[PDB]
Structure formats: structure tokens, C-alpha cells
Amino acid sequence: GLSDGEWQQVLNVWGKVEADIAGHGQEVLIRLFTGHPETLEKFDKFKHLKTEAEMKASEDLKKHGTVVLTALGGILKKKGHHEAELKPLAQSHATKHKIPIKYLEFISDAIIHVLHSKHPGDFGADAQGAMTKALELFRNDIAAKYKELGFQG
Numbered sequence: 001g002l003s004d005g006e007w008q009q010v011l012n013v014w015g016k017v018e019a020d021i022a023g024h025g026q027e028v029l030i031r032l033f034t035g036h037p038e039t040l041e042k043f044d045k046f047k048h049l050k051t052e053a054e055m056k057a058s059e060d061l062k063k064h065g066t067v068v069l070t071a072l073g074g075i076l077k078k079k080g081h082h083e084a085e086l087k088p089l090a091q092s093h094a095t096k097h098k099i100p101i102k103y104l105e106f107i108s109d110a111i112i113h114v115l116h117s118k119h120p121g122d123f124g125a126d127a128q129g130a131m132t133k134a135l136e137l138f139r140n141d142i143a144a145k146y147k148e149l150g151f152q153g
């Protein structure tokens with residue numbers, strides 16, 4: 001996947017993320033649910049949100065949003081030595097949450113969108129680089145385990 005240099009850039013940028021996980025976790029999820037309204041239907045818990053406003057005005061989402069960048073954070077610090085921590089993840093989104101690989105494709109772009117909005121001007125090309133190749137690795141390894149289980153949908 002990536003080289004040390006790129007792993008550097010990845011955990012450096014994770015730097016920005018750790019300084020405010022609930023605010024970053026919140027804007028990503030709000031990035032997803034408004035950009036792609038159908039992802040919202042997957043959370044019985046949030047299907048009740050109708051506006052952007054009502055979304056920001058929600059502590060539960062802020063909460064959920066911290067569970068996620070905390071679980072990702074975990075896997076990203078492994079530097080691709082995540083089967084351990086990803087295996088458990090692959091089966092729940094596959095079998096119980098039932099989330100399509102494209103929905104994992106969307107949120108990935110939303111990470112990168114989100115970081116440019118919040119850090120416009122110090123999220124450069126090399127960084128953008130290595131963060132994308134790490135979200136791809138993550139995304140491809142899930143694919144791999146989603147294949148294993150026939151989650152064709």
C-alpha cells in the first residue's frame with residue numbers, strides 16, 4: 001500500500017483530526033447525510049433529522065461521530081496492520097448494518113472534503129495524496145471481506 005513517508009503524512013494529518021474529533025466527526029456525517037440522503041435511512045436513530053440545522057443541533061450525532069473517527073483513527077495508526085480491528089468492522093456493516101461499499105466510498109470523499117473546509121490552506125497535495133491512498137486501502141480490505149461473504153449488494 002503506502003511507504004513510511006506517506007504513513008508520516010497520514011498520521012501528521014491525523015493530527016488535525018485529533019485536536020477536535022467531535023467537530024470533525026460531526027461535519028463528516030453531516031457531509032454524508034446531506035450530500036447523500038439515502039445514507040440517512042440506514043440509521044433508525046437519525047432518520048428523524050429533516051434539516052442541516054436539526055443535525056448540528058444534535059449531541060447524539062456528535063457522539064456517533066466520535067465512535068467513528070476513533071475506530072478509523074485506530075486502524076490508521078496500525079499502518080495497514082488492521083485485519084484484527086477491521087475484520088470485526090467488515091462483518092457488522094456487512095451482515096447487520098448492511099452497508100454498500102459505495103456508501104464507504106462516499107464517506108471517504110467526505111473525510112477529504114471536510115479536512116479542506118476546516119483546514120483550507122494547510123492540507124496539501126502530498127497529504128491529500130497519502131490520506132486518499134490510506135482511505136483506499138481501508139476501503140479495498142473491507143471489499144475483500146465483503147467478497148468473502150457474498151455481500152454483492
Ligand code: HEM
Binds near residue numbers: 039071107
Ligand atoms: C468510514 C468508516 C466507518 C467506521 C470506522 C465506522 C465505525 C462504526 C462503529 C465502530 C460502529 C459501532 C460498532 C458496530 O456496530 O460495528 C458503527 C455503527 C454503524 N455504522 Fe459505521 N463506520 C464507518 C462507516 C459507515 C458508513 C459509511 C455507514 C453508512 C453509510 C455506516 C453505518 C453504520 C450503522 C448504521 C451503524 C449502527 C447504527 C447505530 O449506531 O444504531 N458506517 N460504525
